[PDB]
Structures are given as C-alpha cells and as structure tokens.
C-alpha cells in the first residue's frame, strides 16, 4: 500500500498472515471473518457466519494465512465499502499463572501472484516545508 499509491487501478488477491505472539502455554480460539465488500460488518459472533471465515486456534497454530480473494480495486476517488477482515474472540485467553495475561497479535499482508497495478500517478503521501541545504546544490 505504498507502491499502490503510485498507481490508479490495483487488482488481485491479497494475502493476510497473522502471528500470535504470546507464551507457549497460551490457548484459545479466534474466529477470523472476511466480509465481502458492501456487506454488513459483523457485531455478534453468531451473525458473523455469512461469508468466508476461519476458526483459528492459537493454542495449536501460531500463524494463520487468510487469503483475501479478487477485489478489482477502483472499478465503480470516492468513499465506499471495500471489504473487511474481522477477528472476534471465540473462547477466552487461557494463560497459566506464570505467563503474562496480556498476549498480542501482529498481522501481515502481501499481494499474491495475480496482483496487477496500472496507470501511474504521483503519490499522495509526500507533499510540506522548506528543506535544509536549500540552494546548496546550485
């Protein structure tokens, strides 16, 4: 998402990867919902079963891979609803009495082989102020 801000139309399967970073004894389950675009963002865990979702037990696994399917990008500059990846608690966090009770997740994203960028524009990120060594290359 810094290369795709140099472009106008992006399209392809992203790939999310989460990684639990708690102790070795930490068990519990996380349900990871993918809401396709335009759909309803789930609030109850029970109505969260609508599209693609996976129950991820981070007592066994330590990393899950969540493929996001084809999205096709800016095929409609305008705010809208373009997907969600939602992660509820399923059970609880079961850590023993010696490990720390505040565990943590980190999440990754990579586009896959079918990702395609086209029409090149300048990035909106960079701009703002005067730089040091101004006119020192003259």
């Amino acid at each position: 998402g810094n290369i795709s801000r140099y472009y106008t139309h992006w399209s392809g399967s992203l790939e999310m990867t989460f990684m639990f970073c708690g102790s070795f004894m930490a068990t519990g389950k996380l349900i990871l919902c993918y809401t396709p675009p335009g759909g309803s963002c789930p609030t109850t865990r029970e109505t969260a079963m609508l599209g693609t979702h996976i129950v991820w037990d981070f007592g066994l696994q330590s990393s899950v891979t969540l493929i996001i399917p084809w999205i096709s990008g800016s095929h409609y500059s305008t705010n809208a609803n373009v997907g969600y990846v939602t992660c509820f608690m399923q059970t609880n966090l079961i850590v023993p009495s010696e490990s720390s009770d505040t565990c943590s997740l980190i999440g990754f994203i990579a586009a896959k082989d079918d990702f395609s960028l086209r029409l090149m524009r300048d990035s909106p990120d960079i701009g703002i102020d005067h730089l040091h060594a101004a006119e020192a290359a003259y």
Partner: protein, 211 residues
C-alpha cells in the same frame, strides 16, 4: 475439511458407518463446521447437552435448508475441543446419545417444549449421574462416546450416522441424537479456571425433500 470455513482436521467414527447417500443433496452449502459457542467449564459444572439437529435450525445454510425443506436426511461429524494448558486436570465424556428421551425429576409431568428445545443455547444436566433420564452415566459408554482426558488429549471426534427407523424425518419436532459432555473428573487447579469447550458440528450426507 468441510466448507469454505476450514476449521478442524479429521479423517473417531461410530456404528461402523461412514456416511454415504443411501432431490436436494447439499455438499458445499451444509457440509461445513458450524462452530457453536464455547461453554465455560469450571469446577462446579455439571454437564452440557446439545440436541441435534435442534442446535442447527438457526445456523447457516443448514438452517435455511430447515426452514425451506419439510423433510431432512443428514449424518453428522462432530468435533469437541477443550483448550486447556498443561496445568489443568480433568476428564470429559463426550457422549452422543441416540433418542435421548429426557426425564423430569420428582414429578409425573413430561418435559415441555421449553425443556427439550433449546437450540444453540444447548442446556445443562441437572442430575448428570443418571443422565437426566434415570439410567446411569456409569453404563453410558455403550453409546458412541469419546474421552477427553486433559492429561493426554484435549479434543474429540464422533461421527453420527442417520439414526432413524424412518427413512427421512421432519426436523422442527423430532431430534435424533444428543451430544452430551459430562465432566466425570472435575476440573482442577490451585488458583480456582474457566476452561472453554468448543463444539463444531459438521453435517454429512445431507438430503432435503419437500420445499
């Protein structure tokens, strides 16, 4: 692996019958794991019971194939997982009772609609030593059963074939099986622990007749 929801990994079966189709036959709609809520197993927890397929009238493409189909025909593939650490001790009996005609204690009045039909909520044994029907837990290993001994494993897997004298059944009034989880040896740790028990039901060999 059943459905777009990859949940748990299986291949223990029951009654020597891996399900086969003995009309609408769902294979990608219903054949998927409908994970229920995870019930908190504590020290003073008596038991839990889920009457199938009453627990699945609400949830999913099976639930739409109940409200839009008069007769159903489905086997199951169930999966109980009890995620506790290496310091928890305990033992569950994951028993799958066919035709669990429950009993009401101390009265001559039969159980009503709101004692037998719970659904996703499940329920709880009151006298688990006699399985709420006057029999015995000590003989209850004659059913399809499985042991979750938290010393050894923490998961269970039972396959539930089609258990009717009838060829097909109507779902909103009759319940074939009854998954029931009774902690024989109660849970222990010194801190004094709400260990969760997660139940995933996956239907197998679904048939539905009568739109």
């Amino acid at each position: 692996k059943l459905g777009n929801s990859a949940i748990v990994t299986q291949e223990c079966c029951a009654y020597g019958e891996w399900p086969n189709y003995l009309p609408t036959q769902p294979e990608t709609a219903t054949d998927r794991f409908y994970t229920l809520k995870s019930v908190k197993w504590e020290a003073g927890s008596t038991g839990w019971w889920w009457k199938l397929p009453d627990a699945l009238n609400n949830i999913g493409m099976f639930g739409q194939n109940v409200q839009h189909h008069y007769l159903y025909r489905s086997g199951f593939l169930i999966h109980v997982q009890c995620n506790a650490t290496r310091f928890h001790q305990g033992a569950l009996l994951v028993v799958a009772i066919p035709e669990h005609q429950r009993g009401a204690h101390n009265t001559n009045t039969s159980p009503g609609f709101d004692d037998i039909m719970k659904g996703e909520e499940g329920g709880t044994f009151n006298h688990p030593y006699v399985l709420d029907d006057g029999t015995s837990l000590a003989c209850a290993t004659i059913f399809p059963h499985q042991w979750i001994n938290l010393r050894t494993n923490n998961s269970a897997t039972i396959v539930l074939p089609w258990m009717n004298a009838a060829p097909m059944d109507f779902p909103l009034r009759h319940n074939q099986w009854t998954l029931a989880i009774i902690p024989v040896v109660p849970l222990g740790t010194r801190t004094m622990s709400m260990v969760p028990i997660t139940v995933s039901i996956a239907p197998m060999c679904c048939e539905f007749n009568g739109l």
